[PDB]
Each structure stands twice: as C-alpha cells, then as structure tokens.
Design a protein around this ligand. Structure first.
Ligand SMILES: *[C@@H]1O[C@H](CO)[C@@H](O[C@@H]2O[C@H](CO)[C@@H](O[C@@H]3O[C@H](CO[C@H]4O[C@H](CO)[C@@H](O)[C@H](O)[C@@H]4O)[C@@H](O)[C@H](O[C@H]4O[C@H](CO)[C@@H](O)[C@H](O)[C@@H]4O)[C@@H]3O)[C@H](O)[C@H]2NC(C)=O)[C@H](O)[C@H]1NC(C)=O
Ligand SMILES: CC(=O)N[C@H]1[C@H]([C@H](O)[C@H](O)CO)O[C@H](P(=O)(O)O)C[C@@H]1O
Ligand SMILES: *[C@@H]1O[C@H](CO)[C@@H](O)[C@H](O)[C@H]1NC(C)=O
Ligand SMILES: *[C@@H]1O[C@H](CO)[C@@H](O)[C@H](O)[C@H]1NC(C)=O
Ligand SMILES: *[C@@H]1O[C@H](CO)[C@@H](O)[C@H](O)[C@H]1NC(C)=O
Ligand SMILES: [Ca+2]
Length: 388
C-alpha cells in the first residue's frame, strides 16, 4: 500500500444526495447507546467511519445527568463503521475531550486531547501506538478540529489552538509523519480567531474553513502549503455568511479580509468549499440558534467580496428541528475527489429541558453530479418518549 496524495480534480457537483443517518436518539429510548457530541466522519481508502466524543456513559443511565459539560476525564473518542450506531461494542480509541483523525493511506492518525484546561496534553496515536505528545502552550484549553485532518504524501496536517475563546488566541499548524510531529507553523494571514477547522485536500495544499468565536460571523479560511509549511488566512468572501449567530442576509457582510464584527461572538463548527469563483456552503437556517440546516452555492462566493447571489439551495433539516455542528470529509473517486458533509443533530439539555442529558445523532450527505429531489431529515426522537 502507498500513501494518499489526493491528486485528482475535484468532482463537479450539482448539490448533495442522502448518504447515511444513525438514528441514535430514537434508538436510545430502547437500547444501550452512548451519549455523545462533536461527531465527524472520515474514510480510509476502502470504507467510512463515524466518530464522536462519548461522555463515558449510555443514555438510559443515571450518569447521563448533566452531560451538558464539554470536558470531563471520561470523554473518549468513539469509532464505528459509518452507519452502525454507538452501542456497547464500540471501540473507545483514546481519551479525548477534543479530537481529529485521518488516514494517510497506510494507517490511522488520531490526535486526542485530555487533561486540565490550563495544562491539557495531546497524544498522537498512529497505527495503534502512541507515537508523540505535546502540552498546552497557552495554558487555556488546547483544542483541535472536531473533524478530519488531511494527509498528502505521508504528511498529515491538523490545526490547533490554545488561548482565549473570545479574545486573542495562539493557533498553530502541526505537520506529522507517522505520528511524529515533524514541524509546527504559527498562524499567519488576516484571520483573527481560528477554531474548529473543517479542512480538505486541494492538491498540493490543504484548505480549511473554521470558526471565529471572537469578532466574526463570517468564516475564517486557512491555507496550508504542504511544501514549505507556510500558512495564510482570510475570511470567506461570501456576503451570505455561515456562522451562527449571524446578522441577516439583508444586513450581513464580508470583505474577504477581516472579521465582519456582525454578531461575532460565539459560533458553531461549519464548512464550505471553493469551486472556481463560487462557493458551496452549509449553515443552520436560523440566524440565532442551531436550528435547521441548508446548503447552497453562492455565485462568486469565493472570489468576490460580499457576493450574495445564491443558487441550488437544499434543505437538509427543516427550520423547526434542531441541528448543531457540521463539517466536511473528502472521498477519493475513480476520476475525481468528492466532498461530503455530516450534520450533528443535538437533542436534550440546553434547549430541551424535559430530560437531563445532552446528546446527538447524525445525518450525512455526499455531493453528486447527478439529479436529486427534496426532503428533510431531522433526528426524529420524541422528547416525550425519552428516558430522564
Ligand atoms: C503542567 O504539566 C507539567 C507536566 O506534568 C507539570 O510539570 C511537572 O511538575 C512536577 C511538579 O513540580 C515536576 O515533578 C517534580 O520535580 C521536582 C524536581 O524539579 C525541581 O527541582 C530540581 C532540583 O534538582 C530542579 O532541577 C528542577 O529544575 C525543578 O526546579 C521534584 O522535587 C518533585 O517531587 C517533590 O514534589 C512533589 C510535588 O510536586 C511531591 O509529591 C514529592 O514527594 C516531592 O517532594 C516532582 O517530581 C515535573 O518534573 C514537571 N515535569 C516537567 C517535564 O517539567 C507542570 O507543573 C504543570 N503546570 C501546572 C500549572 O499545572
Ligand atoms: C475544547 C472545548 O471545550 N470545545 C467546546 C467549544 C468551545 O467551548 C468553544 O469553541 C470556545 O472556544 O464549545 C462547543 P459549544 O459550546 O459551541 O457547544 C463545545 C465544545 O466542547
Ligand atoms: C499520486 O498517487 C498515484 C497513485 O499512487 C500516482 O499514480 C500519482 O502519480 C501520484 N501523483 C502525485 C502528483 O503525487
Ligand atoms: C507528492 O509526491 C510526489 C512524488 O514524490 C511529488 O512529485 C509531488 O509533488 C508531491 N506533492 C506534495 C504536495 O508534496
Ligand atoms: C440530575 O441532577 C440534579 C442535581 O444535580 C437532580 O435534581 C435531578 O433530579 C437529577 N436528575 C435525575 C433524573 O435524577
Ligand atoms: Ca462567530
């Protein structure tokens, strides 16, 4: 077996088609399913897997109480073949309250982060063994992507950040070969806050669309040159804008260079990808809450500042239903490399108070160059039937 180099043109896509759904919450009311959050999907050269950060407990378990908290020592990274829900036979790959995994064509790489907030540690697990580790450099919650990393020719990139959640932070891009950190580049360019990057290969580089939790409702971009380790960053040009909270398609802007300062605080992990001068993107339908989910193409959303000409829209989750994080994953086809995405459907505590736990399910779509129809695919569980 040889290393993945992802050197195939990006497939032309018409939109996205239904791919997978796990119905975990619906199943949690009549079975032993893990309580999770921050899921993602990634594929090796033969098949795809679904990942998620568990909460060290099943749902119909008193231990599910107050699982709104994000960082506890019992969080582990779960990994199952795409489509099989997180039941008791699931493998906990490592201890992690924040993670990222990707396959280089020869073996899996998992970057798992646990520990105290002020002194977390990230373990780099490659081919089943712990190969390296690094400690917090800013003493303030070392965190990573919450989606897949990408490898070209045997070198994998993962962006990480340590520092303020709503203030200046220290973001770096590590390069790792066979689990070993061979280089670290600090962030450069004009992005002001970078978190939860959704990266994809763009031979010979890697491009990431991230979360600005400080000053922007528009999304930062991070360009990584695999050849010399040089970084560059900006914000997506699209005047449509993909963070939540955000302004209003009417009063939202982006100049491609700086955080727009329009309801900048907070956000949600999301994605987007360029296609010539256009941009394919996805976001919650609601501008205030993590509700509904839609995707569309923005004519010129990549190259022209504040472009708002939308086309090819699709509703993935109707606006009366809950959504959450979303990220991207790439899959190698016979002649081109395709782009797909998953969307986390959060249920429970925070918005829903009948129960005491917080967990999620997922639904995933893959681009298509063919035809498609219409629909809506939400979680599906009736909160009134749920335990707790
Ligand atoms: C973030 O995480 C890191 C990594 O885990 C922590 O660093 C470790 O901190 C511990 C505690 O200080 C270190 O272990 C201790 O080493 C001491 C020796 O080092 C000092 O003294 C020698 C003297 O020759 C100097 O050369 C050296 O420079 C140091 O000044 C031991 O004496 C310690 O044992 C004694 O104290 C402990 C409690 O601390 C008692 O329980 C023991 O009984 C004993 O009395 C201990 O072995 C460790 O070496 C550090 N690791 C590294 C790699 O540096 C950070 O502290 C942590 N930061 C925060 C804020 O949490
Ligand atoms: C490592 C970590 O705790 N990540 C958490 C992030 C993080 O708090 C923000 O990105 C601010 O940096 O928040 C999300 P959410 O609260 O948006 O739902 C839950 C995550 O577990
Ligand atoms: C990428 O890998 C394939 C299959 O190994 C190989 O044929 C191709 O030449 C490689 N291309 C580049 C640019 O690395
Ligand atoms: C990948 O490897 C092939 C063969 O070594 C090389 O020609 C190509 O330029 C490399 N690409 C990158 C991005 O390193
Ligand atoms: C969850 O915890 C709170 C106190 O922390 C308690 O009042 C509540 O009843 C618990 N939920 C259940 C279902 O026991
Ligand atoms: Ca924001």
């Amino acid at each position: 077996v040889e290393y993945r180099n992802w050197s195939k043109p990006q497939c032309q896509i018409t939109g996205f088609a239904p791919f997978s759904k796990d119905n975990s919450i619906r199943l949690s009311a009549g079975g032993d399913i893990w309580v999770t959050r921050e899921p993602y999907v990634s594929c090796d050269p033969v098949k795809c897997y679904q990942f998620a950060l568990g909460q060290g407990t099943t749902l119909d378990n008193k231990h599910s109480n107050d699982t709104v908290h994000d960082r506890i020592p019992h969080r582990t990274l779960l990994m199952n073949e795409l489509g099989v829900p997180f039941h008791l036979g699931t493998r906990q790959v490592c201890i992690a309250w924040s993670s990222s995994s990707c396959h280089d064509g020869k073996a899996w790489l998992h970057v798992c982060i646990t520990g105290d907030d002020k002194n977390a540690t990230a373990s780099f697990i490659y081919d089943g063994r712990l190969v390296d580790s690094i400690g917090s450099w800013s003493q303030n919650i070392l965190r990573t992507q919450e989606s897949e990393c990408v490898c070209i020719n045997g070198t994998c990139t993962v962006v990480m950040t340590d520092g303020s959640a709503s203030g200046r932070a220290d973001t770096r891009i590590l390069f790792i070969e066979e689990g070993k950190i061979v280089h670290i580049s600090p962030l450069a360019g004009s992005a002001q806050h970078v978190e939860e990057c959704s990266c994809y290969p763009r031979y010979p580089g890697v491009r990431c669309i991230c979360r600005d939790n400080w000053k922007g409702s528009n999304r930062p971009v991070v360009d990584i040159n695999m050849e010399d380790y040089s970084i560059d960053s900006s914000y997506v040009c699209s005047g449509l804008v993909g963070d939540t909270p955000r302004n209003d398609d009417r009063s939202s802007n982006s100049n491609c260079r700086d955080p727009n300062n329009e309801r900048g605080t907070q956000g949600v992990k999301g994605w987007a990808f360029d296609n010539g001068n256009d941009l394919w993107m996805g976001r919650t339908i609601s501008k205030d809450l993590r509700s509904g989910y839609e995707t569309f193409k923005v004519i010129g959303g990549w190259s022209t500042p504040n472009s708002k000409s939308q086309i090819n829209r699709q509703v993935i989750v109707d606006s009366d239903n809950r959504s959450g994080y979303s990220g991207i994953f790439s899959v190698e086809g016979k002649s081109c490399i395709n782009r797909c995405f998953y969307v986390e459907l959060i249920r429970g505590r925070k918005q829903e108070t009948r129960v005491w736990w917080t967990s999620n399910s997922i639904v995933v779509f893959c681009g298509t160059s063919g035809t498609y129809g219409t629909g809506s695919w939400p979680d599906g569980a009736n909160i009134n039937f749920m335990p707790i």
